[PDB]
Amino acid sequence: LFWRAVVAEFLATTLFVFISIGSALGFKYPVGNNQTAVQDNVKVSLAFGLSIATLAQSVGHISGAHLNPAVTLGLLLSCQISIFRALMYIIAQCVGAIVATAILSGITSSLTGNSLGRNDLADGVNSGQGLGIEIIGTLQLVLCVLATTDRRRRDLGGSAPLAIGLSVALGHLLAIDYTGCGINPARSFGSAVITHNFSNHWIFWVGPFIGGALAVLIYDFILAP
Incomplete structure (x- = not known):
């Protein structure tokens, strides 16, 4: 049924976001200077993508497992x-996403103010610079998604969810740390609501939107017919 998909996507995003920040957070907590002075990202990129691949099977059976307003927008x-x-x-x-962070808040305290659960730009990365990154990040992701819903050389066989998540994993490998790999307004917002905003918030919300549109522009008009 129609409504069932709504709740489906709702719960899906809830657990998904939880795992995503859960991993990143997970490495940084036991007594400061021992292993995670600055965590080993490959684990984080992995979880971020692998998650999508799994629930895409479970919930994506009915709802579609978008877990990303931007991807939906491009679609x-x-x-x-x-x-x-x-x-x-x-x-x-x-x-x-909001319930996700909310539920995760009940852990421990160390630094309240700077980059905790949310993504932002570090050092010499001007907003514009940050914008292009997210633009491309989402552009990649959308490209793969539209790609999955069509014939393709030796057709995908069946690991469709795995392929898409891998695409998320790659998109992640490039900007996971660069822009915290927003490419999903939900992920950036969820964290924003609990800390509760910051002026730099627009970037992570505008990039995926403009990028996804640009993505279809390429496929739809030049790489489709």
Whole structure:
């Protein structure tokens, strides 16, 4: 049923976001200077992608397992996710992330103020610079998704969820640390709501939007017909 998908996406995002920040957080907690002075990212990129690949099987069976308003937005233009479906879907995806961080708050305290659960730009990375990164990051992800819903040389065989998550994993490998790999307004927002915002918030929300649109532009018009 229609409504079932909404809750499906909702819970899906909830557990997904939890795992994502859970890993990154996980390495940094036991008594400061021992292993995680600055964590070993490959684990983090992995979890971030692997997660998507798994629930994409479980929940993505019905809802679609978008877990990303931007991806849904890109899909809106091409995949035609219905004028009304998109709106509700984004609502469920957005709110779910919030419960995720909320539930994770009940852990420990060390530094309240700077980059804790949320992503931001470090040192010599001007906002514009940060913008292009996310633009491309999402552009990649959307490209893979639209790609999965069509014939392809020796067709994918069957590991569709794995392929997409791997695409997320790659998109992650490039900007996981660069921009905290936003490419998903839900992930950036969820963290933003609990700490509760910062002016730099626009970047991580505008990039995926513009990037996804640019992505379809390439496939739809030049790489589709």
